[PDB]
Ligand binder design. Sequence first.
Ligand code: COA
Ligand code: CA
Length: 433
Amino acid sequence: ATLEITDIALVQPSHQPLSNDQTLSLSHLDNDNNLHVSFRYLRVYSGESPSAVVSASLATALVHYYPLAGSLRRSASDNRFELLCSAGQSVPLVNATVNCTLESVGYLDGPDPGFVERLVPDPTREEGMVNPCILQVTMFQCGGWVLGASIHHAICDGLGASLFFNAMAELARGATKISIEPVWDRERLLGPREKPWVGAPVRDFLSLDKDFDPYGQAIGDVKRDCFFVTDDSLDQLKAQLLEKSGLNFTTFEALGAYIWRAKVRAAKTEEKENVKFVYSINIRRLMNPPLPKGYWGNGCVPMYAQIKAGELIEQPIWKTAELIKQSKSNTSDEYVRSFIDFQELHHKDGINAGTGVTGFTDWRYLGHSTIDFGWGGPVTVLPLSNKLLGSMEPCFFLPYSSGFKVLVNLRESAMPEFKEAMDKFHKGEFALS
Ligand SMILES: CC(C)(COP(=O)(O)OP(=O)(O)OC[C@H]1O[C@@H](n2cnc3c(N)ncnc32)[C@H](O)[C@@H]1OP(=O)(O)O)[C@@H](O)C(=O)NCCC(=O)NCCS
Ligand SMILES: [Ca+2]
């Protein structure tokens, strides 16, 4: 089962939005060192070819979204990213071909056929700044196909990228203009205060060490695996957590606690180490004033819960679920401004969440089914990046179309015991207490 790169196309805006070079600056959220990665993910789809249709809509989208065709540069000044856009810039589109069928490979929902990494560019740090947006279209023998995207995380979050992709789709679906015009305004809207201030809720999470690389820790090879989780399993868990605590818990709080406990037990973390649950909340709608609907920059911030590893592995699940629930209350306009001001004060002083960070991202929404180029909405979405939110072992909740998959990245050494913890879970043996 083999994949071949047939050609690479350089796709320019359909008309050139720029006369003159324009150097754009990024928000203080965009320049967090934790987002210095090329975020990689793929969408699987069941005549003009998808290559033509995708590339033509990319062209027209790039009129408004031309910064994706830019280059990221460190600025001599302060070593923050700026984005160099000139006329003639392009997005690369890799055109590929695999000699098999989507159904013969179970639409990529199952185990990796062994080319799944080859389905989306994997740029180096240097390459991924020259080209902060690379797309790939890979045809299967059934006329089924995959859209891969490598987007540098400094330019947008999942929601921002989704804005960009929904625009391409809607143009592919016949539209001649896009429904939501993207807004830059980045250093105006998410810039620091003149006299920076940082509250305890941000100071209690973060730490300075210029030598510490959160994505360079020596944990071994990190494996990817998905576990199917049933609505019934989740409702029995929720009902027992309620029996024992008197609280009702979201799936994210309940399953999140179980998964975090299992991960940490299984990595054999030492009782006294501080470990973290870190997730990404939307703040577009919570700022004062709220951010414009077309903001496609980073509009997310990390929230956290923290606890000694021994307490997590030995206290009841419902105490851990409650702690994750409490963390959602730190969420305020001020928390975000506290966060931005810490980046202002300490950007070059190695801001970090320390060791033992597990990252959690809910992808169950984000607007994937609306991304339809003429072959229906995606039948499977699969994010390949394992470097996120300060974690080398991030976990995603993937969407529906009875239940949904959880994707976990975990050090090879811990994966067996974890797989066993998910088998137990699938049988309702939750060992809550
Ligand atoms: C922080 C967060 C993950 C916590 O979610 P939560 O604990 O599930 O709590 P919420 O109040 O958001 O959701 C409450 C309930 O409504 C449901 N819900 C939320 N949005 C929904 C939607 N669009 N449609 C249907 N149900 C929805 C949830 O599934 C949950 O019920 P559940 O127990 O069945 O899962 C979530 O609120 C959030 O902010 N997500 C944004 C993440 C994001 O988009 N990141 C991308 C960055 S790269
Ligand atoms: Ca601190």
